[PDB]
Design a protein around this ligand. Sequence first.
Ligand SMILES: N=C1NC(=O)/C(=C\c2ccc(O)cc2)S1
Ligand SMILES: [Mn+2]
Ligand SMILES: [Mn+2]
Length: 331
Amino acid sequence: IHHHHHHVINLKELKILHTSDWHLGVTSWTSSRPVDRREELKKALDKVVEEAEKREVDLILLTGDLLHSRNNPSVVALHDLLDYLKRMMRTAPVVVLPGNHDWKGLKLFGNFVTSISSDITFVMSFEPVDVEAKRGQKVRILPFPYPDESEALRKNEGDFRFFLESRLNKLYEEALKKEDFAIFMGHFTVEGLAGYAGIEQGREIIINRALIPSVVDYAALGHIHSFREIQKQPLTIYPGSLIRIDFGEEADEKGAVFVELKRGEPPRYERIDASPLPLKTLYYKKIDTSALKSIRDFCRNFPGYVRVVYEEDSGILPDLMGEIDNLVKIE
Ligand SMILES: N=C1NC(=O)/C(=C\c2ccc(O)cc2)S1
Ligand SMILES: [Mn+2]
Ligand SMILES: [Mn+2]
């Protein structure tokens, strides 16, 4: 046949796959028992990609931290990224909103790649971009990346906040000039999140959810590891990551989201579960004979990774990480 976009008259529906926060390249628990997450992660992504193909989505949105390493991603990590980007592009046009990147290689790459292809678009600034979806639908993208110099501008909280708000107002106005659909994409922490917020060791951008341009058909967010449905109008969602990165994500649901839009109807979505490996934390006062029994018994047939937390030493610990290959941390 052909392998370009279709052009359907008066089509007022849009099918979206939104995934985020891949963290390609991650090795977890390096201080206790390093575990390369690559194999588990690629399984999840395959599942997401296969779902996309089955649902014949029209557009694929990628937000958040696709690479784990801020400034120095490994070659393997890069190769997996570009590999998965190609696979999606074979399914549907892809729009990518990069996370908090350091290396300048990305911006030149993203622009060049966007200039030469009609199936991937990198949105690296605050400028809106119109894109064409799989069946010819015109989609206006309103991007909200991490601001480059303003976080380091050291401008007071007041002026910085006003900068952000004025940026959102601009996006609001640009969304009103929409042909067909408009989608917001952002990479920041929604104000008053509980409890994926209050994360440390990273410079944070807090945005009140009311300030997300209310006239968009969908608000695709990334940066947060847990799936959250922030609000219904405009439908605003963090997909979450695809694997449980660390033990604070034990109780999380991981996957991507499928979203359907129809002009005269309200937006509907289904979660696509990545069904990643489970995590479990076991708690004890001391590692006594009872605790050893409990640990050994639990880990025995548990398919995922296990952390043990305890308060006090009480003699020489047996080589538990030896007998139990599942146990990745005893602090
Ligand atoms: N600290 C960082 N987090 C990221 O996601 C980084 C880079 C990135 C580059 C391309 C892309 O599509 C997503 C993220 S750097
Ligand atoms: Mn982030
Ligand atoms: Mn993240």
